Design an enzyme around this catalytic site. Structure first.
Site, PDB file in Angstrom:
ATOM      1  N   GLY A   1      -2.336  -2.351  10.118  1.00 22.50           N
ATOM      2  CA  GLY A   1      -2.306  -2.104  11.543  1.00 22.50           C
ATOM      3  C   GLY A   1      -3.520  -1.305  11.975  1.00 22.50           C
ATOM      4  O   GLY A   1      -4.550  -1.304  11.308  1.00 22.50           O
TER       5      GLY A   1
ATOM      6  N   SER B   1      -3.557  -2.636   3.539  1.00 25.35           N
ATOM      7  CA  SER B   1      -4.508  -2.107   4.520  1.00 25.35           C
ATOM      8  C   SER B   1      -4.126  -0.664   4.817  1.00 25.35           C
ATOM      9  O   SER B   1      -4.030   0.137   3.870  1.00 25.35           O
ATOM     10  CB  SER B   1      -4.523  -3.044   5.724  1.00 25.35           C
ATOM     11  N   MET B   2      -3.900  -0.282   6.076  1.00 19.24           N
ATOM     12  CA  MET B   2      -3.499   1.088   6.367  1.00 19.24           C
ATOM     13  C   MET B   2      -2.166   1.434   5.723  1.00 19.24           C
ATOM     14  O   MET B   2      -1.894   2.616   5.486  1.00 19.24           O
ATOM     15  CB  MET B   2      -3.424   1.310   7.880  1.00 19.24           C
TER      16      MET B   2
ATOM     17  N   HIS C   1      -8.436  -2.982   1.342  1.00 13.28           N
ATOM     18  CA  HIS C   1      -9.595  -3.722   1.813  1.00 13.28           C
ATOM     19  C   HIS C   1     -10.308  -2.911   2.882  1.00 13.28           C
ATOM     20  O   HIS C   1      -9.723  -2.034   3.522  1.00 13.28           O
ATOM     21  CB  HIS C   1      -9.194  -5.090   2.370  1.00 13.28           C
TER      22      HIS C   1
ATOM     23  N   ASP D   1     -10.205  -8.538   0.122  1.00 10.04           N
ATOM     24  CA  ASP D   1      -8.803  -8.200  -0.097  1.00 10.04           C
ATOM     25  C   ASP D   1      -8.508  -8.084  -1.583  1.00 10.04           C
ATOM     26  O   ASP D   1      -8.655  -9.050  -2.337  1.00 10.04           O
ATOM     27  CB  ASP D   1      -7.895  -9.250   0.540  1.00 10.04           C
TER      28      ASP D   1
END
Lengths: 191, 191, 193, 191, 192, 191, 190, 186, 191, 191
Positions: free
Chosen positions: D66, D95-96, D120, D171
């Site tokens: 996000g 991610s986050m 990533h 990724d």
């Protein structure tokens, strides 16, 4: 697209470049196989037979596939007309494009060195809606087409039907060399 | 667009300006590379070989890229036909446009001074949906294409395959001078 | 939909529940429809809650689901295996894809299906799109293959079958009756009455 | 979705099941990280510190990623408040979500056995339109964020910044075991 | 989103949603875009808190990309009007009017978290500029007056010259918490 | 639009009015600069050089701007071909239209009295999505283009690069007189 | 949006807007519509009942809206016995400025950085159909235009001719300019 | 819709559930079917011996969703009486016929329609995938006709004819066919 | 629309009816003024000057308005070329259509009896988005255009600039008689 | 639609059937009256006057109405040119179509027996948005047009203005006989 105009020396006659190549007995199948694009190929094949029943016809294929019935109109026209139809793969010959490539006269099926040839079982030949009875009918028709295509492919490639049934289960991509070894084409052109 | 009409002195013959330039053996690849735009280039290359197998063909490229199979139909036609195909970059030669630029006859690959040349690994050659088995197949085909393009690029540029693998990982933009140093073009035109 | 309200009898008074909260009080957790982050996290929250109410009593996990996200289904799967109480699984209507996985993930000997339920197992589809550059597509193709192998391996463990059997059988959508799922090893018993 | 209601014995108090788990100091981050979902996590983290500053807070993460700024509001709240925030990966932490997972108190970062952890470099933190001057500004801000995230990740993982720069380029999917070896989590739970 | 419910212990119990519980502690959140509706809730909360206790500080937590200028000005004037100091804290980001309201906190009580992002810039369209050239002239003039007003108030908040804010707000000016502190938008950076 | 037909006295030859003006060495660039509209200008410039390498070519510009690479194909063709290319601004010459206007042969760059000439830094030459690494690359390419355009503009105008960097920061609208004083055009036509 | 809940000591739990209504504060926020205008009317009627003598505080943060909806508020403000004090927060534009100026003379306020905009009305409804229908709607719009300028001029103690000039095109005013014009009486600071 | 409240205060459907009345109204979906299952399970415990009244006004819906109801009806101890209101079509007719024999009812002007299933899911992909889905649909078709024939005390061959195309029946025709046992009047 | 074909007696030459009227030096501006429709007018005006620099050109206008820059390309061409351009209003001449009507040679500006002529200040010459600095620039450019158009109108009409500033504030509709009294046209035709 | 080709005997000349009928001085107005369809009528009327100023022009009308300004360009052209313009109603002549029908030369206005003629006050000549001042202006312009059309209709029909004001208040449908009695047409054709 703007189709260039070229001049034939004979007096002079101005052609669009595709009509000029048809004069040399070159028929192009470019892009998806549709009723309209397939019927133009048929019209050109019929026309070229009339012009000279003995000379070879050169059928250049750069196509991702398309309708089976449309491809079969080309296929039956190729086999019917007297002159040999030589086939050449440019860029790609996938699905019915690979079928028509393999359908060329044995010994005259060609591919360019970096072309891509892909064979696979058919997808939907038409939707399967309605009632379970209608879905049964369309499922049966699709299976008959599947068997017909594998049988004709196996004939073209001098392979067993069992081999084509394995190899067309999922998208089977081949280099020109692999297509030659498989039996889809006879030669690979370089110069 | 309205394509101007020009008169050739010979009697007189009226051409659209692109047919007039085809008469001078100039073939344009402008915009995306598609089955249709690629097949016109092929038709023009074949036609020009017939007109004069010995004279050079001038292939002017202003293209952001496009289909790999469509670009390969041009590429194999360029290599097959007897006459040298000289390539010139106008505005830009990106992706398959850069590939076809580098594919010109060695010593006859040109760029204009402010042109932009970009090389990169291919993106989707087609979607990757369906089942994990189908996705595996399409991922494998894309990797084979990736290797084929880097290998042919490395051959064009007289570089190691390892160099093209690094340099095409992400969009690699080059000036005409950088493309000349890299090995994509041979000369930069000024006047 | 309007969820009915039911009254639970206690001493000299009544607690009003929606009918699903009432069934949670009986240790029944429903997974209905697609498996999403939100629907999977509710199952996890209910499984965690029930473990604390009573770590020893069985939890009944009723599954009527066409499938859904693998990561969401794995949050349920790991919660089922982690918590102390046995999670009994029952197939209602259908248990397809991750729904069949979670069905087979129930405590061995306590995996049930109703007589006319439909159980379908298959290799995963896209766990996420494969766009971008060929390097990105390679990465996502590799991740999908690892998931494919992980799911077949865990399925084979659940079913007491060889990994090679699950690799054949999950190649294309494999629909099974409750009897075929029992013979396969996805469920232990078929309920009638 | 209908969120079940559960009864806490004390008299009785009826909770929705998430408010009941908050009473046990469990905070969920489920789905994308947005301003609204991040502020609820912050509100819960603040609230729990006041209830008991010494007891651990359990932050359950099942998130694809996000907004970076939204994730940073959680991150700074986790580090600010006195009680240790233990983090657990359920399903996925990407991610986050992986950043916040690694941001848990060292020694108390957990993952479930079949969870998936992906790290990533950031994508667009916001569009890059307008004038080249505006695009330069947003490109610079994105690079600063990229460096900040890699630097904080490297700190969390006890790795060199150079390692995170390699590994977050594309990724990078990890099993719970690989995330443990990498340094994103400390333990893997089984029972 | 489902907003959790928390129980407050008192003299009995009271069940709150977690935001009403934090309002009881004089914490007002501005999250997401600044709109007439989100700005009026902040104003309603600021007015309510002044009445509950005029002397105690109000804590205004900001995580906002910006929004309407007039909506932000309703908050701004309420902050300055009410007797209690309004302390401001930047969480995640304070951009555009969010940065303005952050800088508008009581001097000495403007905070940011260590990894927050603060962005200041001249306003964009405060409303479309269609119609006739006479209408476009009017709206262009109003936008310039707003631009000058915001730079002037920013310069006052930051103890800087108006000329500095005019340079620095020309294009999106992103600042770390440290840069915002050096600039004069915030007073302190919190860690623990 | 219906393009009028005009008759040239020589016998008679019927032209569309734009082909008739091309016969007088007038090339129009009207509307946005695209690959297709730019390649027609290039084709016309090449054609006119062949017809008479010594006579001036008149390049009439009424354009809001367009693609940089497309405009550069025109720009390099203008500079390459032997005949001087005189440029005239009709209505407007904005962005790449102003660049091509200033690119005319020094001393032969014209504007009509009420024309509008606008110079500015480039906007997006292409979107900036993908990963921060991809965004960095595209931001760098856009900055190189920005510098190249300001440098070539400064050369055209006999100004310092620093002047063009200031003046192209935001849309800089100029009357024909201001463009003449700036150095974008040499003369203003009246009769 | 989630509207906070606050506790009144007397305990009674209110949403924060019902709590402020208890203090005789009525908000007009956003566009003036039949529904938002009728809530203002319902609140004004309710507050008169609770105490006909105490002032009502009408907080305005509105870009404008329907004239008929704004007139339902306007007539309710003038009808009910208690003075309606008006305050501009953020902005009072179009009918929002009209209702701001409609507050009790001496009790019309604005915050220092508020924006007040007055202008002639736009379409009160589309003008389609036949030229006869268009004539009717054009005449009705002109009557409304004159009515609004006349009532504005009364509020501001100005000549009708002044409002006709000044409302021709969007006329933006600071709180100080609105005070000098006559739309508000005072500007609040602390 | 606003659901009335009746007098503890119930919404009128929760009030009727207290009388062991379960409604299936509109299409059969995973969500509407699971509510029926939840209600059937709940009622079995409140009293395993008392009848449950399952009121059906439904055009049909998902087969798997309808089968979750069907298996729950057959599993739980108390008899499930079924009543057709308005219509019972497709899976709605199946669930109507699935009621306890002797306790399947229809109102006089109700409409009952039986037919072979349509798509249980799309048939895209490759011919191999289409073959699989066609086979699964045929198995479902046979299963539904077999269970219908059992409910109606008819031969499987009769249901195969009669479900070939939409077969609309009055309450009297459904009674003669064997889908319902009685028709209510007063 | 199908444009009729007419035969000119000379042998015979077949024209579309608009090319036939161009042969009589009649140029039509019908509908909105766009880059494309304005450039055709310019091309026709240039062509007619070459055919006969001394004979009048008849510019028939039936237009609601359009782009200012496009209208200015016509306007400057009208003033530049040697032959007088007579203007006639058919149906309507509004906005730039009224400007070009008034721009005809003084004494040769005509209107038909029931034509409608409307003059007004310009609207958006382009959107005003972006930053307040960009909006300021575009607002300033629009005001300069507004002043330029009123100044040129006042010159055409032999009126004070102050009169045009009042009268173009809002859409000012005029009958042919009012336009004649105003100074936009010189005569009204009847037979 | 495919417009048939017909051969005129003279040698032979091939026409589309509408150009063939224009050769007989028949001008069609079919469908809505637009700037483009009205300007073709004007171009044809002007052309026919040049061919023979004395012979009648036959203007066949089958139109539901359209733009007033476009219809007025036809109307003024009809009245201006020397040759009488006879008008014939085919199918329908409604709104401006009825106006142009009544505008034919008195004594030469015809209708076919089952044609339908409808007269009514104008609708929106353009939208009425913007400010009340703009709406006032457009309402006033529409009323002036309304009065102008009723006044010209009353003149055509030899009726009082008061009669047309009543009768055009709402759509007034008339048979050919009623239109003849009203004064819109002079005769009804049968054979």
């Amino acid at each position: 697209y703007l189709v260039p105009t070229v001049i034939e020396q004979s007096g002079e006659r101005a052609f669009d470049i595709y009509s000029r190549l048809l004069k040399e007995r070159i028929v192009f199948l470019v892009g998806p196989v549709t009723d309209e694009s397939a019927n133009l190929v048929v019209a050109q094949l019929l026309f070229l037979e009339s012009e000279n029943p003995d000379k070879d016809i050169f059928f250049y294929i750069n196509s991702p596939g398309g309708s089976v019935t449309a491809g079969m109109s080309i296929y039956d026209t190729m086999n019917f007309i007297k002159p040999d139809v030589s086939t050449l793969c440019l860029g790609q010959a996938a699905s019915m494009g690979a079928f028509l490539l393999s359908a060329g006269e044995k010994g005259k099926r060609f591919a360019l060195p970096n072309s891509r040839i892909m064979i696979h079982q058919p997808l939907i030949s038409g939707g399967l809606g309605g009632q379970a009875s209608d879905i049964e009918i369309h499922a049966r028709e699709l299976l008959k087409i599947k068997e017909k295509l594998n049988r004709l492919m196996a004939k073209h490639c001098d392979r067993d039907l069992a081999d084509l049934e394995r190899d067309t289960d999922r998208d089977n991509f081949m280099s020109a060399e692999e297509a030659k070894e498989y039996g889809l084409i006879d030669q690979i052109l370089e110069n």
